[PDB]
């Protein structure tokens, strides 16, 4: 109910070790450790900026 009232425009550039589960390539099955190590986005800034 919190996250149901948002539209999100997320563009990520220059990532490594991407893994998608299909030739359709529509969704990422990469492990969360590599994505969390690559992403240095301050999500708490987004939380205080939409709070």
């Amino acid at each position: 109910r919190v996250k149901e009232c948002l539209t999100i425009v997320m563009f990520v550039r220059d990532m490594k070790n991407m893994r998608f589960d299909s030739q359709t390539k529509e969704r990422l099955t990469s492990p969360f450790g590599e994505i969390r190590s690559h992403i240095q986005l301050d999500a708490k800034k987004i939380s205080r900026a939409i709070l």
Binding site: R19, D21, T29, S30, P31, F32
Partner: protein, 51 residues
Amino acid sequence: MIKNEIKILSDIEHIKKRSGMYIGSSANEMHERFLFGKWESVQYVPGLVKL
């Protein structure tokens, strides 16, 4: 400097090195799922259940 070497793997090592492509999520995670009538929050490893 980053290292660019093209490697070609056999299918046993392709499965054993890229395990998220073929058995799904390979980490101990939590899900809200149906069990015996109850939608409950429980924690497990999905790969053994998938196999």
